[PDB]
Structures are given as structure tokens and as C-alpha cells.
Amino acid sequence: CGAPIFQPNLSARVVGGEDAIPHSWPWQISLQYLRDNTWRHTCGGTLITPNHVLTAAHCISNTLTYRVALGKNNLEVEDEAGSLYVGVDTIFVHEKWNSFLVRNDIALIKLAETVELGDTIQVACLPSEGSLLPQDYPCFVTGWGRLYTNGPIAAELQQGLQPVVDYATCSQRDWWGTTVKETMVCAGGDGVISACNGDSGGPLNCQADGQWDVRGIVSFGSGLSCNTFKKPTVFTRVSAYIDWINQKLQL
């Protein structure tokens, strides 16, 4: 379960969207599509079994051909020793996913190969069904940025902290109003330069008496202002989808 051989950080010292200790969140994967010959990353995801990645629903286009990239830190490389690229077998998108309302932004990627599960490929931990974490709780949104796009990319795997914002808070009319639903986790705090470090469908990492649990999948924000005050990053509540996850995990 969610235990790394490369200790990441915490609110240690680095100010601003920290790069990231090469390989300190080994369940971080990059979802890529082919165009001509080059593969390009669009979304992030989480390794959760030696052949299944949890990811956002809005990251799936029925027409594209995908590949999953494992064990990376710098996207502009193709070796990094402990790295991989695995084809997809099936992508089960939640049958109630709703694009207009952006409700149930979830999808499970059944890989096609065993995925070596080595020293830099590690499986994060799934929360407990129902877990509704305390407001202000420290969590980390990893990712290669690619969310708001217009800013010096992020070939270097990023990572930055996000403080769980309680539903009661998010749902405030002057916050994310009705948009939000108890099935979503909010996060993100008053920034400082901000710089969107997590990608769409990126993981919302949190510790649970040691090990880390995937509490969220990145879903939405403001467009131009990732980390606007009173406009937090909305993620999908993995805990609210443990039965579904467990039902599709066996398909």
C-alpha cells in the first residue's frame, strides 16, 4: 500500500510550487495520447494496483489512443532507469459522469500488462468508504502542471500543498456555490504565485497514520486563475466511490 522508498517532503522549507524529490510519489502516472508519432501527456492519474489507474472522466476522449507512463519525474526524457509505458486495455468511465455539471468525474483505467511494480512504481492507498476528512487537513497535489497550460510547462514533476476545505465551506454561495456536491473534495489555499502543479485527474495525496491515501482526483477550477481566493481546486472524492471502484476493479 501507499508507502514510498523515496521520502517526499511536507511543509518543510521550500516556498512556492516545489519541484519534487525525483520519485517521492511513485503512484503518480502520466496519461498520454499519440498524434502522428509523438506521445503527449494530457492528464495525471494514480497507480492503485499493478494494473489499474484511477483518473478523471473528463480526461477521456473515445477517439484517442492512450499509453500510461510509469516511474517518471521529467517528461522530456525516455529512460530514467525506473520508468515505463504501458498500453491500456479498457477505460471504464463512470456511467453517470456528467459533462455539463461535471458530476462524478471518475474513470478507472484497466491497464494491459502486469506493470513490474518496482522501486519507483508504487500503489497509493484508497481511502475508507465514507471518510470525510477535517477542514484544513494538509494534503499534496502532485502533477506536471498541465492544467492551466499558459505558463512554463513543468518538465519537472511538481508538488504543492492544498488544505482540505470543508464541504460546508466550499458550498458557500460566494465560494463554489451549488456547483459542488458532497461527493467532491475541495482544497487549495489563498496561494502565493499559485502555478497549477497538478494536472487534470491528478491525485490529492494525504497521510493516514503514516501511509498516503488518494483522497482526490483533480476535477475543476476557474480557467485562468488556478487558486483564486474563494475559488478552490475541486477534486473528486475517492471515498465516495469505493464500491464502484471495487466493482470495476474486477472487470
Added chain:
Amino acid sequence: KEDFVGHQVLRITAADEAEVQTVKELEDLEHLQLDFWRGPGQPGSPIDVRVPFPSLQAVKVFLEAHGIRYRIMIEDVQSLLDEEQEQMFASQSR
């Protein structure tokens, strides 16, 4: 498809009617192939224009020489279009 590598959108600001007639005296110049995104109006309002690469330097010095202020809003139009097009592809399905 159209080529826009190196083109630039500039934000001209004609302080007063005078500065306005001179940016218009550049509009008559058909050979420049200016694409006015926010053509000339009342002074004070912004004048956004895409000036092709070959007419790039000549337009600037024209401006500079007339003591007319402009800043570069978009540095390379093809690169934006290139992003847009890349997003669309990344997001295609039926």
C-alpha cells in the same frame, strides 16, 4: 492553412485624435496586410492589430518615429494557435 509564425499583435494607444489619424495612415497602406483586431476608435481606447512578420519592423519604426506608444500583447500568434489546436485534438470524441 494560413501561416502566422512570428506575427505579433500590438496594442497601440493614440493619445489624441492626431495620433489616431496617423495609425489610420498606416491602414490605407494595403501592402502591410494589417489585421486590425481592435481597429481605430476614440483616442484612449486600445488599438489591437496583428502585423505580419515582414511588415513587423517597418510598422514599429513607423510608430516609434511618430512617438506613438505600443506594447506587444502577443509575441508569436502561430504559437497560440498551435496550443489551441493541440488542446482540441487532446479533447476529441463523439
Added chain:
Amino acid sequence: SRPSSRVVNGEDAVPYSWSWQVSLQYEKDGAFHHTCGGSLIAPDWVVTAGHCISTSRTYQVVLGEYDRSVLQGSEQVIPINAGDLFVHPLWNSNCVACGNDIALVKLSRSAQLGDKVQLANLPPAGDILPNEAPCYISGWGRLYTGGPLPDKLQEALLPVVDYEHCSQYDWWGITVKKTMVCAGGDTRSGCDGDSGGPLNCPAADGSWQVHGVTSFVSAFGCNTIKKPTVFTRVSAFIDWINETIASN
């Protein structure tokens, strides 16, 4: 008709005579496109205008080219590695009239120097030309907007205009700096050149020297009386040029 016989005629340069000419091209939808002129000043270095660089693009320079519509066997194509461009640190895209419009591109693999391709001759630092100096521009005519471009390398006699003749209020006024050279200004046209193209002058030796680097022309056209093609004085940038080549 398959390979038509080569006809040098009209304003075509003698094939390969201007042997230090280079073509800077950008990548697009798989193909490169000529965008500026330039002069091969070192085995693996090229000097061109600063405004010809768009950091977000893939470039290549073509050496030993004459007819861009016909492979002739003399051409050498050199891809320009990501960070091998080198714009002057004082070049400011928001003040063209401020000068310092130069830049250098280090070639990924060195030029094969020969009878057909050769190194230019730079003036001595601070060196200055006399009014009416008989110089020759060379290029593929991109400075010209209202019509179709040449396939073959062209040339023109653009006699220089000294500073105090190029500064006169009714010419290029306070826009021209002591760091620039003006050439032409009369009925003789300047449209045969490209941005960043050479202003070659016949040295006191018989050899030719690249005195200029095409910066800009009038808004009204590359043939406007009293508005001569402004070049960057490659002599004012001798210190700079040398270190860049050195330090890199």
C-alpha cells in the same frame, strides 16, 4: 519540364559569388521556410538580425543555396539546436530604433568550407564607411511585400548614406543611430534583401566585408526616396560577437 537549364539573368547574383550568404528557416507543418538572410562568419557560427529569432521555434540555416526551388548539390542544411540562438542582450523588440538589433546562431555541425561556401570578412571595430560607398545587398527579396518572391539569389547596388546624410530631418531623422548604416535612399531599390541580410562592401584590399545586418525599411516600402534601408553596424558589435563565439 524536369531540370530546366540554369539561366542567370536579370538581377540574379552570379551563382555562389556571395559565398557567405545563408538562409535562416523556421519549421512548420513538417517543412522549413525561408525567413531571413544571414552571413556565415565562423566555421560553426552565423550572424543575422535579432528580430529574426522567435525563441519558440525550430530553425535551420541553409548554406550553398542559390535557387531555392532547385536542389543543386551545393546546399548544406544545418538544424539549429534549441539553445544555440544568441540574441544581443540589449536588443529590445519594443524599440527598433534603439538599435542593437543583431544576434548569432551557432551551427549544430560545422560548415564544410570550400570554393562554393566561404567565411565573410568583418570590418575592424568601429570602422566606418564613407558617404556614397558602393556596397551590394544580396538576398531572396523578403523585404518586399507587394508581389511574388525570387527563387534565385538576387543583388543590388545600394550605396551607403553616411550618418549626417542619413540623419537629416527629411530622411530618417532622430530614428537613425551612430550604430547603424543606411544604404540606398534613391530610385535604386532595396527590396532584393531579407531582414538580417548582408550589406557587403568592397574593402580596401579588394576583398568584401559584411558591413551591415538588415534591420528595417520604411512602412511605405523597400524603395522609398529619402528613407534608406537601415542596417546594424556589425563593427559596433565586434567585442560582443567575439566573446559570444568564445564563451560558447
Added chain:
Amino acid sequence: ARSTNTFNYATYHTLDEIYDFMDLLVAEHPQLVSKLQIGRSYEGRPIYVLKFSTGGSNRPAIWIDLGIHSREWITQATGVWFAKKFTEDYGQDPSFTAILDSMDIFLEIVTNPDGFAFTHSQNRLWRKTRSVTSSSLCVGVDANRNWDAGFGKAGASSSPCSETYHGKYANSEVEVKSIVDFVKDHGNFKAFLSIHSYSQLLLYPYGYTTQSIPDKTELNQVAKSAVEALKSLYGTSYKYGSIITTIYQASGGSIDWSYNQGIKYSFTFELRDTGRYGFLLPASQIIPTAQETWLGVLTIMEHTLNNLY
């Protein structure tokens, strides 16, 4: 998208995809939506208007046209969103629900289809129609200068090669004539809104004359409320006022035509952006723009509704 509940509203679409979307929405909410074809464009493409209704015969209506200058891609995409909005909020949102019970809304998502088809295949920044003239090789006319409102007069160009070319005569373009025909024939139109981009502006007549409209006061007040309401969502700022004083004198525009036609509530929105991106507004801003613009639009509809005449 096999349904309109999985259609990606966060990207830009081709004429086709947009045309197929209109079909699903219709096939999905058969009782609420209907797709009308008001004519054909110069190059033969059909011109669709989506009609949102609950019943009755010839109830008062609102006209909303988008995409008349095809490069302004944020207008077609927010047009698609307004489409979905209308069907999600009816019978849920009392402010809108109350509107669809007394009037009809005609939505024209792609007012200039040839121009739009051209921006995807040839020139992204193309803005005119695609007609050909006998006396010129340049193609197109500024459709939003082709209306019969102070037509031909200053604020337009007479050279077929200019981007502000007014066309040979009022309504000479079929894209414009189609609407003129539909609107005039219907006759029960009380509001007329045309969406554009960019400048973040909300304007009301007139654009040609310096002459004030009989009811500048009211329309102007409606503008501050709508500009206000639009600001709620994220603070984006619009300025507002009449066309001519807020921009420049422009000849032959739609809302000057509508207004003279007696459709008192005539406004033009100039969506996001301020110049940072202009027509190349990043896709991340489609939904947001769509949302805030919606709020200011609801206000106008709601005013119309309360002030039926």
C-alpha cells in the same frame, strides 16, 4: 458524444460537431427544443436556429445570435453551452422557468457557417462571410455591417477587400437576409441579442447615428444590472453604454436594425477577453465565460419578461 451529457463543453468544435449537438439536444428534450432551418448560406450549408418553447401560438420571443464574425470562437462555444443551460434549468430555476412559460427563445449558434467552416480549414482569423462579387477577387462581407441600419454610411468600407466591407446592399448576404426574413415574419419579437468578442462590453443602440434612442434611460439601466450580475460570478468587468459612444461609429449593424424594427430590448455583448488573448481565448475560459455571460443574459430576459409590450 453519444449524449449531450458527455459532450465536451470545454473545447472548441467544428461546424459538424456543433450541428450534431443540436440534434441530440433536440432528440433529448423533444418537448422543449426544436431545430428550425431558416435558409442556406452562400456555399449551400444549412442555417439552423434552435427554438426553446413550452407551447402556445406565436408567443413573444427573444432572439440570440452568435458567431456572426466567425473568428470570435468564444461565441459559438458559449452558444452551445447556453443551449444546454436552457434545458437543465427549466422546471428547476424559477427565474428562467418563469420566462419559458410566457415567451420563446430562438438561439442561433452559428450565424455565419461558411466563415466558421473557413476558420477551421484555412484561416483561423477569418471574420467575414464567403460570397463572391463580380467586380473583385476578394471574398466576403462583414455580415454585421450588412444590415439595413444606416447602411452604406460612415462606419463601414465599400472596398470588397476590406475586413469591414459592407456588401453590395442592405441584406445582400443570405445569412443576414435569412434572419431578417424570419424575424420580420414572426413579428412577435421583444428582445434581440447578438453575441461577439472581445472587449468585455455590453452595448445598446445606436452605432451609426449620434442620435439618441427614444429610451436610452431604461436600456442603460438594464445594462448596469446585467453588467453587475455578470460580475458576481468572478469579478470580470464589462463597461457599457451605446455603441457609437462606447466604441466608434459603425454602419449597418444588427441591433440598430432590430431596434428600428421595434424590438426595444436590443443589445450586443462583447465577450471575454481584453486583448491578452483576443480571439484566441484559451479553452479553460469557455465554461467560465459561459456562466458569467449567462447571468447577465438572464437579467435582460427577465427584464423583457416583466416589461412585455
